[PDB]
Amino acid sequence: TCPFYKKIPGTGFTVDAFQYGVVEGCTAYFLTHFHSDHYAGLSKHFTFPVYCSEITGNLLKNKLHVQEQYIHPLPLDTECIVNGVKVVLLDANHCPGAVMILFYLPNGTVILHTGDFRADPSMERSLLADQKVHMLYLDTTYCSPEYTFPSQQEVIRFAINTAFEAVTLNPHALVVCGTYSIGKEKVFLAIADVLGSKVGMSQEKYKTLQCLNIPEINSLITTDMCSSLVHLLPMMQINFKGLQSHLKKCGGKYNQILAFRPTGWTHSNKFTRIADVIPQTKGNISIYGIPYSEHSSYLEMKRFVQWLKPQKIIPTVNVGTWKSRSTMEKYFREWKLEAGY
């Protein structure tokens, strides 16, 4: 049945709740972003109103064939009325089209639902600064102090410098990048930009990217693999056997692969600086795991919550075990005592 942390009190609304069938009493289904653990259940046969960003609505129509008459895209940073209730969509700094949702309840309660987000100080200057938030539905993916990672900018600098040096040393090396969903586009686009290449990919993945309003995308991506020296493959194929096989398909154009796997976190982070990252190598194939995150680190999350000062926090991630839930509640109390709210 639908969990309570997916339901907005005082309304008929749910958030990211498409896999429960007809949720009783639900008049509007919101979708924060196009990731499968959130959209699971949507299809051309869905006949209730879906509220989302423009980019998410393009993906619903083109990838899932949801019918246009049930897609209700909203502009960002704009007060809108849904079934009698004021709402605002804010940029979540997650994947393309991902939003946080502000709900202004008729009784005066204000609720923020972060969806999935990577907290940033730029959020402290959005419409959130203009009123108090009483209840926070919080993406707690990395809510423990061991989760540190570098800025996205530092990670992309490392990837660009590594790829440029490799291909300049060996003009017959191929660069491969893994993907399994939208997000993390800067990884492969930045590497293709420094090399003077388009990114080559499957027709299905090209279609997905063309839904994203990214400026000058026709100039950076292609379905012609022969003309590209940066290739995008499914994340599952980013291993030595999968890469050896890909190299066979390129017909002797290339004699070396440099591959990137942009994981979230991996325990090399508690010790290793970004400068100190090394690949796994076998023969003429090297694989780099780089810590490119589209979720808050522990400290980013803590800063956001201590700025916002909510009266009540409702975690939405890691809620399935008692030790995880109790641990998170202990951090929330610490943050509140330190900051004085």
Ligand code: NI
């Ligand atoms: Ni997500």
